[PDB]
């Protein structure tokens, strides 16, 4: 189908075919040298240059070497720099380039390739959709939003642009507005729309506006394999981990950590209170749009398995105590943090991102009335000097209707069935 041979490349199609046949038979090493020979002899040939790059690409895949793949990325760029490149080849070369840049984590590099692709092919709507992803991946929601607005303005039924626009709107807290976009985009069935992120945020936006259909989408997201279940809707998962909303200390196996938290709770409390009194700016407001209303801030000692050294200056004994428990200080998918919540607070139903952690809550200052946490189908209260443990990958919700502040300490641990190499390898969240 695709037209990849310019005028000169048609005159050497026998050589080009022989080189490509070696690659398709898995003789990567022979293929690389055959295309390098063709690039040497025919230095302007775009098909020879694309062959070289595709061979490096295959070679990176066979060796699982990022080094080899970075080489292919530049060769894909070389293709686009040659004269008289056929349009289909130009687009394949630069698209593969962007995709391999994203695979390596070079999101700003991928973005630049995508910008170029859209300038070279201004009527390809799919490339604009891909450019919007480029922007989302570097955190540029403002430009992503304009890209999908542009897409919808000429192809208003594009399902991919709809779900992504709906995702952006929801992230901006434009909750009612996001719902039709997310819903119509998933229903479009277009490639790229069957994605757990859109099921997740569509049901969430519905819950926030009181729409009872929310769990219809959770159930369809479960049926289509995005959620472990209707209640456990995390998206960065190791499958097979024991899934249970509430855990006892003995079920986790972290009995020494729990004992240390409980036996030394007043010290943990008092350092948090001192920071409240004298260094309150260390407490940062929660910034993930999780509150319906009220005041909630957190003072973080560890995130992504990394100690915040300045923060630990405010809780030095607590940080020293925690250093003996790598199951939390090395939990690169969790945090260690104080959490203060004041009256009039309601945290929406929500789920954390990963089933790879469990969350311990140690009560520090707990009003006698008004504070409770629901996880799935079971609601509990905190107690001063006592640890609660739940799996925040299950939907959970919190209320604060006391007459004074509530202070807890949150200690995240690796899910206990995760192996040592799993704990060393999983990307941090």
């Amino acid at each position: 189908k695709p037209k990849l041979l310019n005028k000169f490349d048609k005159t050497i199609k026998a050589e080009l075919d022989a080189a490509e046949k070696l690659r398709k038979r898995g003789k990567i090493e022979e293929a690389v040298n055959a295309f390098k020979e063709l690039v040497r002899k025919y230095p302007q040939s775009p098909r020879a240059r694309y062959g070289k790059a595709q061979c490096e690409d295959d070679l990176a895949e066979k060796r699982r070497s990022n080094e080899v793949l970075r080489g292919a990325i530049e060769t894909y760029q070389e293709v686009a720099s040659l004269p008289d490149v056929p349009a289909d080849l130009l687009k394949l070369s630069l698209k593969r380039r962007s995709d391999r840049q994203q695979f390596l984590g070079h999101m700003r590099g991928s973005l630049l390739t995508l910008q170029r692709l859209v300038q070279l092919f201004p009527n390809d709507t799919s490339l604009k959709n891909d450019l919007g992803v480029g922007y989302l991946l570097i955190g540029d929601n403002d430009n992503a939003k304009k890209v999908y607005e542009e897409v919808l303005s000429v192809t208003p039924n594009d399902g991919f642009a709809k779900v992504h626009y709906g995702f952006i709107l929801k992230a901006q807290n434009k909750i009612a507005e996001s719902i039709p976009y997310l819903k119509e985009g998933i229903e479009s069935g277009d490639p790229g729309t069957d994605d757990g992120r859109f099921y997740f945020h569509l049901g969430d936006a519905m819950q926030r506006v009181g729409n009872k259909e929310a769990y219809k989408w959770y159930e369809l997201g479960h049926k289509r394999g995005h959620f472990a279940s209707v209640w456990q809707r995390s998206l960065y998962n190791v499958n097979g981990l024991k899934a249970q909303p509430w855990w006892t200390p003995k079920e986790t196996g972290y009995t020494e950590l729990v004992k240390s938290l409980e036996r030394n709770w007043k010290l943990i409390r008092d350092e948090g209170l001192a920071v409240m009194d004298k260094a309150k700016g260390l407490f940062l407001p929660e910034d993930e749009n999780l509150r319906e209303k009220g005041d909630w801030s957190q003072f973080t000692l560890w995130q992504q398995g990394r100690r915040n050294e300045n923060a630990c200056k405010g809780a030095p004994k607590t940080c020293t105590l925690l250093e003996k428990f790598p199951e939390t200080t090395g939990c690169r998918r969790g945090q260690i943090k104080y959490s203060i919540m004041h009256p009039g607070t309601h945290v929406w139903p929500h789920t954390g991102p990963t089933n790879c952690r469990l969350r311990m809550h140690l009560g520090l200052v707990i009003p006698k009335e008004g504070c409770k946490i629901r996880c799935a189908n079971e609601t509990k209260t905190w107690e001063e000097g006592k640890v609660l443990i739940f799996d925040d990958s299950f939907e959970h919700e919190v209320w604060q209707d006391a007459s004074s502040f509530r202070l807890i300490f949150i200690v995240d641990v690796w899910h206990p069935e995760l192996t040592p190499q799993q704990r060393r390898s999983l990307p941090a969240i």
Binding site: N66, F103, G105, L137, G139, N289, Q304, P427
Partner: peptide
Amino acid sequence: GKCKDGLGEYTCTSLEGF
């Protein structure tokens, strides 16, 4: 932005190839 208590970012991880 990082995914601490929620799933609000488009992606929560920063991948590194193979």
